[PDB]
Write a protein that binds this ligand. Structure first.
Ligand SMILES: [K+]
Ligand SMILES: [K+]
Ligand SMILES: [K+]
Ligand SMILES: [K+]
Ligand SMILES: [K+]
Ligand SMILES: [K+]
Ligand SMILES: [K+]
Ligand SMILES: [K+]
Ligand SMILES: [K+]
Ligand SMILES: [Mg+2]
Ligand SMILES: [Mg+2]
Ligand SMILES: [Mg+2]
Ligand SMILES: [Mg+2]
Ligand SMILES: [Mg+2]
Ligand SMILES: [Mg+2]
Ligand SMILES: [Mg+2]
Ligand SMILES: [Mg+2]
Ligand SMILES: [Mg+2]
Ligand SMILES: [Mg+2]
Ligand SMILES: [Mg+2]
Ligand SMILES: [Mg+2]
Ligand SMILES: [Mg+2]
Ligand SMILES: [Mg+2]
Ligand SMILES: [Mg+2]
Ligand SMILES: [Mg+2]
Ligand SMILES: [Mg+2]
Ligand SMILES: [Mg+2]
Ligand SMILES: [Mg+2]
Ligand SMILES: [Mg+2]
Ligand SMILES: [Mg+2]
Ligand SMILES: [Mg+2]
Ligand SMILES: [Mg+2]
Ligand SMILES: [Mg+2]
Ligand SMILES: [Mg+2]
Ligand SMILES: [Mg+2]
Ligand SMILES: [Mg+2]
Ligand SMILES: [Mg+2]
Ligand SMILES: [Mg+2]
Ligand SMILES: [Mg+2]
Ligand SMILES: [Mg+2]
Ligand SMILES: [Mg+2]
Ligand SMILES: [Mg+2]
Ligand SMILES: [Mg+2]
Ligand SMILES: [Mg+2]
Ligand SMILES: [Mg+2]
Ligand SMILES: [Mg+2]
Ligand SMILES: [Mg+2]
Ligand SMILES: [Mg+2]
Ligand SMILES: [Mg+2]
Ligand SMILES: [Mg+2]
Ligand SMILES: [Mg+2]
Ligand SMILES: [Mg+2]
Ligand SMILES: [Mg+2]
Ligand SMILES: [Mg+2]
Ligand SMILES: [Mg+2]
Ligand SMILES: [Mg+2]
Ligand SMILES: [Mg+2]
Ligand SMILES: [Mg+2]
Ligand SMILES: [Mg+2]
Ligand SMILES: [Mg+2]
Ligand SMILES: [Mg+2]
Ligand SMILES: [Mg+2]
Ligand SMILES: [Mg+2]
Ligand SMILES: [Mg+2]
Ligand SMILES: [Mg+2]
Ligand SMILES: [Mg+2]
Ligand SMILES: [Mg+2]
Ligand SMILES: [Mg+2]
Ligand SMILES: [Mg+2]
Ligand SMILES: [Mg+2]
Ligand SMILES: [Mg+2]
Ligand SMILES: [Mg+2]
Ligand SMILES: [Mg+2]
Ligand SMILES: [Mg+2]
Ligand SMILES: [Mg+2]
Ligand SMILES: [Mg+2]
Ligand SMILES: [Zn+2]
Lengths: 110, 51, 97, 166, 206
RNA sequence: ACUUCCAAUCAGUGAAAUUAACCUUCCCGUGAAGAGGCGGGAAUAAAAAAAUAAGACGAGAAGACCCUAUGGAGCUUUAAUU
RNA sequence: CUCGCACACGCUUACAUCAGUAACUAAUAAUAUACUGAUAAUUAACAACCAAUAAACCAAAACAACACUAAAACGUUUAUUAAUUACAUUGUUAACCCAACACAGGAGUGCACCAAGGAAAGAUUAAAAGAAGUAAAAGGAACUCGGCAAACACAAACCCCGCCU
RNA sequence: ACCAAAGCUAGCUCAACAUACUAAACAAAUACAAAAAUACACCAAAAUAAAAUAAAACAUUCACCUAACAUUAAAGUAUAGGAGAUAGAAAUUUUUAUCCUGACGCUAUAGAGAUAGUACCGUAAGGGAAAGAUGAAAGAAUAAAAUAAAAGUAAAAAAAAGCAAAGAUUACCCCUUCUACCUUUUGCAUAAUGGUUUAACCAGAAAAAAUCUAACAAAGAGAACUUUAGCUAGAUACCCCGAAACCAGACGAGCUACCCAUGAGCAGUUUAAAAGAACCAACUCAUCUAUGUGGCAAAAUAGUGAGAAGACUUGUAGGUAGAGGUGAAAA
């Protein structure tokens, strides 16, 4: 079908500015206690997660160099140790990942 | 249909154009100060004395 | 319909130059000259229009008669088409007839 | 083309006599030739009218529109101008007084359909204009109450005069 | 190397093959033609290096030295008299080296200055009995010598040192030509002892 | 009944036929003889999204049918001229 | 999930290295075989170019032994001449060509069907209508112009018009 | 407030004068498939122009329409014409040289098509564009000045009811009164035609007889003619867009119809068979239905089908050209 007449701008403005078609505001925005940036209540902080993801990639990159083959996987548990630390008695019998940087604050040793 | 945009402004400098100036730039005054005078630290108190 | 927004430089025309002061001086050469030169022997312009007047058809015909052999190929063709169209329009068209 | 929004920041007002009310700051900023469309950019501009700059950035932080990032950059760089180029302290004391979207220069292309037909394609470009004014945001107007409607109606019935009287 | 220019062109104190000129005038543009009064090469009495006096502008009555002449638009550029100020060093976080720049002047605003009285005087070319074209003043009636100016190369022939690939003046002016009626082909062949016996056959030209 | 491509919501790019102005209802009557607009009455806060195609004599092609034009052309011959 | 390598014909640097993409090109983004700037490249053995006259000679290709009817591309030797003298010239890239498009179309030969080449879904919800596919109670053409379409069927016979390919 | 607006040059037109008329560039290569130094040749040619149109049809005829050596008159006269349309001379007459040339011609939708026969669309003949704006200096781009005035949007979505307006009113509506505009018709709000809106551009033209004004008047006119108040001069006049067609000369058989050269394909299976036999692929046609209908596609995709050792498919290259070619006739 084809339109019969040109829509006037008075009609178009009513349709294009109806409250349904407008952008709704968000009232669930909060400041992250740790870093002070912005995040939603039900969503993890973007800055804090990006902080973790960068560190996780570095740890995984070190693991790749410790298993050259593409089908080599450990048969035991894994523990990550940073500079200035030594494996504990309970941590023995597990593969050791060494990182040169100082242990990050958020990461907690057990 | 084959119409595009023009007028993107950028400032590029090379040694060659600067060395090819037919008339060298004339400077009315020098750039820096030849020697900086070093006043004695007591001028804040000597200024209160006339002679 | 946008008009210019700046006043143009006014044309300072001098009414007393050589052309305007001496305009139409020898128009009465025949009257006051023992009738030796008709005033039509002062007209400057086309060869076929010195001292002659006519409508569009008689002008194109006259041009072809005098300077027809001196015209260019393309100009000679365009003149022929103009003569034919005017001949057909003036005689075979119109209101009063 | 026309560029008058940029030149509004060069207006210098005469010095104020002592005792006069403090003049709130006014910062005019804009961005030209944004790839985003004119109509789509308008909804984002309508969103942040009348809100303070800090909550205006918060709303545009999580918006999924491609223009949300573009507007947030404009507000951030306009805030830096306000606190440095102008003597506006308290960089959190600004509110978006006016925001709107204009149309730029379009590029025309050919869009093919089939059967040897074609349609002219318009590459869309839009501008964004924002004005920041120092001070707390103005309070939004509440709907007229029951007493307000009654007061206007009684006043209307009291303005009546004898039509075609004498 | 010679650079071809469009039939209509605008000159702005920049050489045609410069990046500044290309930035100012892109190859795809053409502007309005300015009115330039025609001066024949025999009527241009203003050269580069002679003192001239500025008549009109912010500075009037001052004298200076001509450094550049634009023959295409009939311009003479004095050395730092009709000056406007611009910036040269520009970057994101720094600006400086404020350098005055001299604006062009037309021929009608510049009159040549006689060496003796140091006043502007009309100049007309005259042909003397010695066969040399020397400019002659109107009021004082004294001739004005040509303004010897250093060339654009910046090399003075008076002070020069011959390099490894430079020919000495003695060898350059040494004459060894013996004008005989043998071509260069014949002379070299007999100089090195190249001997040829057979001759070419008949070849038809058409 | 159940899957995939469509579909509806979100993000990016973004076309076409169409369009006198429209603030674009129902019924009966009238009327260039089938009315959203006239007359007599009824109904009637304003907008958005998704659907079904009765009407806008819907959109598309200056009707192929039919006739007219001292307007054309193809074919055939016992038409006229040759 | 499967049209893959190469030559001929065509196109003409669209190929390669490095850098940039606010915008232009890709019908979007990342990004770069496809847009911009600089630099660089295809090396002949393969292919093109690559003698004349006179004379002898009825006897097919099809594994060709020997035959068929439609009677068949495909040359050697003798004689008379032929500049005789390292290295000549030219084609060597590609994701490509003809269709207004980076189009589900059109495109000859050799060898493989892969050891090679590629990605049907941008993210969700799982309404109607529409397209494509699978399955079904009892009945099995009751549908409809017609058994059109679909099918666990893949058969038998009559007539009309043309003989048949 | 965006989009936009404004400018005056580039050059062009019509003449005049005028040398006397294929410019500029030609180092090398240019009619082998042009721009490729180099081998026994063939080389070349002409036959009245026709028709669209006018006669309201159309057959004899139809100005200019290739080749005139002009102007003032004889004259639109003698003559030639389906004696219709219209065509139309001559005898005999007139004409004093050089300068005085420039513009009551246009100014970027104008003027040449032109910034250019270049991009681009066509195999080819051929068709053929849009596009420029600062200032004395941008070697004054933290750069400057100017209108902020077209449609379209933003600033500022809408509140019963009606050709959107008018009469008004303290008050925007509410009330009352009014069947859009042109064209075409006996008659249109008509559900008859055309237009989304804006800017630019686009369509009445001729002086025989006449009327008005004036000069001079039995005579008028700066020769040639008209004259029983007439003669000379001025002023007052008659459009634009559109067919199917017709004729002449070019360019097209790289798609397709047919043919001449030169090549290349047909595996398996069944039979004494390479038999215009049979089953079934590659390959070639396109039966039926469904999607698609500005689509992937200006004829396709999916399923299903017919031929598949022949009157078969197919590559390269050549031949036949419009009063024709070609055709296992479907005009
Ligand atoms: K007439
Ligand atoms: K309907
Ligand atoms: K190519
Ligand atoms: K039946
Ligand atoms: K109709
Ligand atoms: K009509
Ligand atoms: K009309
Ligand atoms: K051929
Ligand atoms: K297709
Ligand atoms: Mg196509
Ligand atoms: Mg449109
Ligand atoms: Mg559009
Ligand atoms: Mg969307
Ligand atoms: Mg309504
Ligand atoms: Mg009715
Ligand atoms: Mg009523
Ligand atoms: Mg009514
Ligand atoms: Mg929808
Ligand atoms: Mg709907
Ligand atoms: Mg209606
Ligand atoms: Mg209907
Ligand atoms: Mg219709
Ligand atoms: Mg009709
Ligand atoms: Mg019929
Ligand atoms: Mg009749
Ligand atoms: Mg007829
Ligand atoms: Mg006819
Ligand atoms: Mg015919
Ligand atoms: Mg007969
Ligand atoms: Mg191409
Ligand atoms: Mg892509
Ligand atoms: Mg890269
Ligand atoms: Mg590249
Ligand atoms: Mg496409
Ligand atoms: Mg995909
Ligand atoms: Mg999708
Ligand atoms: Mg469904
Ligand atoms: Mg089934
Ligand atoms: Mg069942
Ligand atoms: Mg039945
Ligand atoms: Mg039934
Ligand atoms: Mg049937
Ligand atoms: Mg079936
Ligand atoms: Mg029967
Ligand atoms: Mg048959
Ligand atoms: Mg039979
Ligand atoms: Mg006729
Ligand atoms: Mg007629
Ligand atoms: Mg004729
Ligand atoms: Mg007779
Ligand atoms: Mg033009
Ligand atoms: Mg104009
Ligand atoms: Mg406007
Ligand atoms: Mg009303
Ligand atoms: Mg009526
Ligand atoms: Mg009627
Ligand atoms: Mg009438
Ligand atoms: Mg109508
Ligand atoms: Mg009609
Ligand atoms: Mg219409
Ligand atoms: Mg008369
Ligand atoms: Mg005829
Ligand atoms: Mg013909
Ligand atoms: Mg062929
Ligand atoms: Mg076989
Ligand atoms: Mg068979
Ligand atoms: Mg198929
Ligand atoms: Mg199918
Ligand atoms: Mg099926
Ligand atoms: Mg079969
Ligand atoms: Mg069979
Ligand atoms: Mg031919
Ligand atoms: Mg024929
Ligand atoms: Mg056939
Ligand atoms: Mg038949
Ligand atoms: Mg038939
Ligand atoms: Zn955080």
């Amino acid at each position: 079908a084809a339109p019969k007449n040109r829509r006037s701008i008075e009609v178009n403005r009513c349709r294009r500015r109806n409250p349904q078609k407008l952008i709704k505001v968000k009232n669930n925005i909060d400041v992250c206690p740790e870093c002070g940036h912005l995040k939603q209540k039900h969503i993890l902080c973007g800055y804090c997660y990006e902080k973790v993801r960068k560190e996780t990639a570095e740890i995984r990159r070190q693991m790749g160099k410790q298993e050259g083959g593409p089908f080599r996987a450990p048969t035991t548990e894994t523990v990550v140790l940073y500079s200035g630390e030594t494996p504990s008695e309970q941590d023995q019998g597990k593969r050791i990942i060494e990182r040169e940087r100082k242990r990050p604050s958020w990461f907690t040793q057990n | 249909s084959e119409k595009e945009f023009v007028e993107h402004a950028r400032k590029a400098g090379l040694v060659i154009p600067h060395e090819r100036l037919e008339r060298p730039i004339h400077l009315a005054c020098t750039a820096g100060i030849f020697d900086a005078y070093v006043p004695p630290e007591g001028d804040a108190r000597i200024s209160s004395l006339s002679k | 319909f946008h008009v210019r927004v700046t006043l143009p430089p006014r044309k300072v025309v001098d009414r007393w130059n050589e052309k305007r002061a001496m305009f139409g001086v020898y128009d009465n050469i025949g009257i006051l000259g023992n009738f030796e030169k008709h005033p039509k022997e002062l007209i400057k312009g086309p060869i076929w229009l010195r001292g002659w007047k006519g409508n569009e058809l008689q002008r194109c015909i006259r041009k072809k008669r005098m300077v027809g052999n001196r015209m260019f190929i393309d100009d000679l063709h365009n003149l022929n088409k103009r003569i034919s169209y005017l001949y057909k329009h003036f005689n075979r068209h119109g209101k009063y007839r | 083309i026309s560029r008058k929004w940029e030149k509004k920041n060069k207006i210098v007002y005469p010095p104020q006599l002592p005792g006069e009310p403090r003049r709130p700051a006014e910062i005019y900023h804009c961005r030209r030739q944004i790839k985003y469309s004119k109509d789509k950019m308008w909804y984002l501009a309508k969103l942040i009218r009348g809100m303070s700059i800090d909550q205006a950035l918060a709303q545009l932080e999580f918006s999924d529109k491609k223009g949300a990032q573009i507007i947030k950059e404009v507000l951030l760089e306009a805030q830096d101008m306000a606190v440095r180029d102008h003597n506006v302290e308290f960089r959190s004391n600004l509110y978006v007084a006016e925001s709107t979207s204009g149309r730029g220069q379009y590029l025309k292309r050919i869009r093919y359909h089939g059967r040897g037909r074609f349609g002219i394609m318009e590459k869309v470009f839009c501008h964004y204009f924002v004005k920041l004014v120092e001070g707390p945001p103005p309070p939004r107007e509440a709907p007229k109450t029951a007493v307000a409607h009654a007061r206007e109606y009684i006043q209307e019935l009291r303005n009546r005069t004898i039509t075609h009287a004498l | 190397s010679k650079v071809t220019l469009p039939p209509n062109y605008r000159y702005g104190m920049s050489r045609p093959g410069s990046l500044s000129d290309k930035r100012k005038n892109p190859p795809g543009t053409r502007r309005r033609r300015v009115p330039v009064e025609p001066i024949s090469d025999e009527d241009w009495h203003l050269f580069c290096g002679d003192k001239v006096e500025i008549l009109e502008g912010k500075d009037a009555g001052k004298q200076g030295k001509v450094v550049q002449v634009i023959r295409q638009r009939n311009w003479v550029v004095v050395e730092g008299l009709n000056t406007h100020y611009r910036y040269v060093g520009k970057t994101v976080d720094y600006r400086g080296t404020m350098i005055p720049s001299e604006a062009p002047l037309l021929h009608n605003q510049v009159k040549l200055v006689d060496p003796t009285d140091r006043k502007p005087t009309d100049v007309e070319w005259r042909f003397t009995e010695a066969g040399e074209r020397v400019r002659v003043s109107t009021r004082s009636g004294r001739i004005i010598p040509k303004p010897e100016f250093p060339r654009a190369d910046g090399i003075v022939p008076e002070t020069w040192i011959d390099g490894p690939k430079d020919t000495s003046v003695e060898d350059a002016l040494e004459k060894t030509y013996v004008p005989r009626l043998k071509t260069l082909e014949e002379e070299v062949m007999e100089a090195m002892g190249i001997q040829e016996t057979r001759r070419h056959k008949k070849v038809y030209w058409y």
